[PDB]
């Protein structure tokens with residue numbers, strides 16, 4: 001039974017022989033390297049006395065993906081000051097009050113706050129919402145907006161499901177199949193975007209009129225992942241049609257950057273809401289596929305396993321996600337090897353560190369039993 005029921009979180013590092021002391025030190029060090037004053041590795045930048053943001057070092061922009069990640073990270077680390085700085089920046093510079101996407105958040109902004117687009121990224125919206133629910137539960141709803149956390153979360157999720165009824169907007173979930181979409185105006189998805197465990201919680205805290213829908217979304221996402229992941233390799237494409245097959249129209253139909261998060265999501269869902277036969281077997285397939293492969297040689301692969309000449313742009317993130325997946329198969333034949341590989345992998349430096357490091361800290365929290373559900 002998941003931690004949702006027991007309220008006890010598995011410390012996989014510890015179960016695999018690591019000392020509690022070293023684990024505690026490592027988790028804190030990972031945090032400082034990302035949010036502290038460590039230019040070579042940090043991804044979080046403070047601005048003034050009330051603003052802050054995560055920088056996509058590789059594209060020199062601020063993404064809701066990063067901001068939502070930063071907020072989730074801050075609440076897990078019980079750092080309201082960081083959470084508030086980031087959320088404040090998001091509402092001030094990313095929240096859109098105009099255009100067909102009003103009510104959502106511009107997916108990419110320049111460091112000075114200027115919007116690069118008026119299009120949103122659904123995976124950011126879903127992270128903002130849960131992060132906000134957790135903030136409300138850990139610290140309580142702030143008196144002045146937009147710090148009225150739970151109200152902002154329910155408000156945002158309302159838009160995500162009902163947008164397009166009272167106007168020209170589009171919902172972020174297809175109302176018929178209950179599946180999250182790549183972006184509001186398309187009818188296809190992105191496997192890494194599916195977070196059944198997040199929806200389960202939304203089915204408890206979102207507006208009551210949508211609680212049934214969210215329970216249905218969680219179930220729909222679990223089924224979706226079964227058809228999206230290759231049956232032999234376990235690899236999922238970055239983009240995929242609702243039918244499950246890859247959408248390679250623009251080159252996103254293979255196993256690359258986006259895809260890595262699938263294994264992490266499966267792991268966290270298993271820890272929160274319980275393991276499943278499918279999840280364990282899925283992780284065993286992915287890890288098995290990488291068992292005879294060296295990090296320095298990780299490539300972009302077709303989901304059937306065929307290798308491209310191109311190397312993985314974020315091999316450290318891949319390592320972190322495969323390790324985090326071990327939560328869905330603690331007795332798997334490669335579980336220990338993956339956790340050890342991650343432990344022996346340093347936080348990344350360079351202009352491509354952003355994505356790797358985000359996946360890195362999430363894996364560190366989850367594997368140490370510190371990526372928890374915060375109840376009212």
Ligand SMILES: O[C@@H]1[C@@H](O)[C@H](O)OC[C@H]1O
Nearest residue numbers: 056058063065257258355
């Ligand atoms: O924003 C991320 C980008 O920084 C990385 O390079 O590829 C995956 C994206 O999600």
Ligand code: NI
Nearest residue numbers: 021022025026
């Ligand atoms: Ni030590």
